[PDB]
Design an enzyme around this catalytic site. Structure first.
Site, PDB file in Angstrom:
ATOM      1  N   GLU A   1      23.038  18.448  11.635  1.00 33.51           N
ATOM      2  CA  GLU A   1      21.900  18.841  12.463  1.00 33.51           C
ATOM      3  C   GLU A   1      20.662  18.016  12.144  1.00 33.51           C
ATOM      4  OE1 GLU A   1      21.865  20.811  14.990  1.00 33.51           O
ATOM      5  OE2 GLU A   1      23.739  21.968  14.868  1.00 33.51           O
TER       6      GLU A   1
ATOM      7  N   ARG B   1      19.040  15.546  15.062  1.00 34.47           N
ATOM      8  CA  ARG B   1      17.747  15.947  15.614  1.00 34.47           C
ATOM      9  C   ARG B   1      16.591  15.207  14.946  1.00 34.47           C
ATOM     10  NH1 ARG B   1      18.181  22.243  17.532  1.00 34.47           N
ATOM     11  NH2 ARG B   1      20.396  22.589  17.019  1.00 34.47           N
TER      12      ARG B   1
END
Ligand SMILES: CC(=O)N[C@@H]1[C@@H](O)[C@H](O[C@@H]2O[C@H](CO[C@H]3O[C@H](CO[C@H]4O[C@H](CO)[C@@H](O)[C@H](O)[C@@H]4O)[C@@H](O)[C@H](O[C@H]4O[C@H](CO)[C@@H](O)[C@H](O)[C@@H]4O[C@H]4O[C@H](CO)[C@@H](O)[C@H](O)[C@@H]4O)[C@@H]3O)[C@@H](O)[C@H](O[C@H]3O[C@H](CO)[C@@H](O)[C@H](O)[C@@H]3O[C@H]3O[C@H](CO)[C@@H](O)[C@H](O)[C@@H]3O[C@H]3O[C@H](CO)[C@@H](O)[C@H](O)[C@@H]3O)[C@@H]2O)[C@@H](CO)O[C@H]1O
Ligand SMILES: *[C@@H]1O[C@H](CO)[C@@H](O)[C@H](O)[C@H]1NC(C)=O
Ligand SMILES: [La+3]
Length: 469
Positions: free
Chosen positions: A107, A111
């Site tokens: 993640e 991101r």
């Protein structure tokens, strides 16, 4: 080593008035999501739009500002210059990677590393490059395993990692370690240090030494032994963006990564043979496979594969180019049906192919929609690669559904049951709604030469990276 002005960022108003007005509406939706994030949750990772406060997912550990970093390139491309500057100033002062707690390596890579990289390539502001490389350095200890397959979780301050407690067999997850490649190639390019590229190239070496059962990739790989875990295969969650990044690594290399090309087309042929089926009603879908046994269910996450197939068409040998364009269109059609057969006109998390209706969910815990982008993502590729107007028509249906059912006073909320009339808000504005769902909608109603696919490869969080040559 040095910044070059980005190609294909000039933003012209479309020539047709209705298209201009539709795109302007999508920008208004971003303004609503962003302004409410800033009003109630500035500096926190996500917004709770019903409670009107912050939401702090454990995936981000103690890092702050996920929605700020994820939104940078969307704000930039929509011409929200004041908002972009306000985000940049917050990043300069408050974005901190020397924090305790564990983060999801996957993640944080897609991101934060991806969002900072895109913001750098679009704007030339060196703070984004500095921060992207700082974070990349902090992630290097995740690869400190016998095989080189990285840990899922990492304490960035101590450099100590581990896998998910409930991961099957303690295995690393294919989509998580398989979706680092694009970012790490750009980290090596910008830092001049080959360490980053070597980490993700080693993952390839591990995978290529393994026999693939039936040409398929299990979603579990043990980092201590380098051997497969459970033989569960899916082009949806836990698997999907591994395949995505095989294709995109080849494209992002200016088609020089011949290993990625062969891995991708070999993988897709096995997926077609073993996973792709036609319902009695004529809908093409991609099923899950567990030790050889198909489960005839498809995920919202799997719907990204329509755009992946189409994006890979031009590189494929003829006459498989048309074959892949048509396969992408059939996936797009099935995913549109999963949208259109709900009450709200946004699709469920998973949908099955048994009577009495096809392409609907039946399990209560699979009827939710958490603002996900994958169907709109596929519409965007299909529009750009076919210019069939139905893809813009279907995208606009989703816009109207988002406005009627997900827009609330305090932002945008996901839904728990897309099949009922009564609202069922989950009270989370996912940062990928701003990074992905709204960016892809905005691009769909732009001209082809805004972030043209010929020059930009989107990471799996819709953060565009330039081609490396
Ligand atoms: C059958 C089963 O349950 N299997 C499990 C596996 O699925 C697990 O593998 C992954 O585990 C990761 C970590 O899971 C833990 O943390 C998360 C995060 O919690 C924090 O954040 C949330 C959100 O803000 C917040 O609500 C929390 O409070 C917390 O702060 C938790 O959600 C997890 O909780 C679930 O799982 C527990 C144990 O497994 C259960 O005890 C819980 O009750 C809970 O169950 C829920 O989920 C189950 C799994 O679906 C489900 O069966 C159940 O009914 C219930 O809904 C846990 O505590 C996860 O982060 C990771 O999640 C990814 O995959 C799932 C499954 O497909 C997706 O639903 C999810 O959205 C994630 O998908 C992204 O990431 C994967 C790779 O990880 C990609 O392949 C995928 O494409 C997605 O990436 C895209 O996502 C965005 C767009 O959609 C965008 O970012 C971009 O486009 C990306 O490309 C997996 O679940 C495994 C290890 O935990 O355990 C197995 O048992
Ligand atoms: C979508 O559903 C409506 C019913 O709500 C139906 O009238 C319409 O034909 C459907 N669209 C397609 C393409 O089948
Ligand atoms: La994705």
């Amino acid at each position: 080593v040095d910044f070059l002005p980005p190609v294909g960022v000039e933003n012209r108003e479309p020539a047709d008035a209705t298209i201009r007005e539709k795109r302007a509406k999508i920008k208004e939706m971003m303004t609503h999501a962003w302004n409410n994030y800033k009003r109630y949750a500035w500096g926190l990772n996500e917004l709770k739009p019903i409670s009107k406060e912050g939401h702090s997912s454990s995936l981000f550990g103690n890092i702050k500002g996920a929605t700020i970093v994820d939104a940078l390139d969307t704000l930039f491309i929509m011409g929200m210059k004041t908002e972009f500057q306000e985000a940049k100033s917050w990043i300069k002062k408050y974005l901190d990677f020397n924090v305790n707690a564990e983060v999801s390596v996957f993640e944080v890579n897609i991101r934060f590393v991806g969002g900072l990289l895109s913001a750098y390539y679009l704007s030339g502001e060196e703070i984004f490059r500095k921060k992207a490389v700082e974070l990349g350095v902090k992630l290097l200890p995740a690869f400190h395993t016998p095989s080189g397959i990285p840990w899922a979780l990492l304490n960035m301050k101590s450099g100590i990692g581990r896998n998910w407690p409930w991961a099957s067999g303690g295995s690393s997850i294919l989509a998580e370690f398989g979706t680092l490649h694009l970012e790490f190639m750009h980290l090596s390019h910008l830092s001049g240090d080959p360490v980053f590229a070597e980490k993700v190239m080693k993952i390839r070496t591990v995978l290529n030494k393994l026999d693939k059962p039936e040409g398929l990739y299990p979603n579990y790989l043990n980092p201590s032994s380098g051997q497969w875990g459970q033989h569960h295969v899916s082009v949806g969650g836990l698997g999907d963006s591994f395949y995505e990044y095989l294709l995109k690594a080849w494209l992002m290399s200016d088609k020089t990564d011949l290993e990625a090309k062969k891995m991708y087309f070999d993988a897709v042929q096995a997926i077609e043979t073993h996973l792709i089926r036609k319902s009695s009603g004529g809908l093409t879908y991609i099923a899950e496979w567990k030790g050889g046994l198909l489960e005839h269910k498809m995920g919202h996450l799997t719907c990204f594969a329509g755009g992946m197939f189409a994006l890979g068409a031009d590189g494929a040998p003829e006459a498989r180019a048309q074959h892949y364009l048509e396969l992408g269109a059939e996936i797009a059609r099935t995913c549109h049906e999963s949208y259109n057969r709900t009450y709200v006109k946004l699709g469920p998390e998973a949908f099955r192919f048994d009577g009495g209706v096809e392409a609907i969910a039946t399990r209560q815990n699979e009827k939710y929609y958490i603002l996900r982008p994958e169907v709109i993502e596929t519409y965007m590729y299909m529009w750009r690669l076919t210019h069939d107007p139905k893809y813009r028509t279907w995208a606009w249906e989703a816009v109207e559904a988002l406005e009627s059912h997900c827009r609330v006073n305090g932002g945008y909320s996901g839904l728990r049951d897309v099949y009922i009339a009564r609202e069922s808000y989950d009270d989370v504005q996912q940062s990928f709604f701003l990074a992905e769902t709204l960016k892809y909608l905005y691009l769909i109603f732009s001209d082809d030469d805004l972030l043209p696919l010929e020059h930009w490869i989107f990471n799996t969080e819709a953060h565009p990276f330039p081609i490396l040559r």
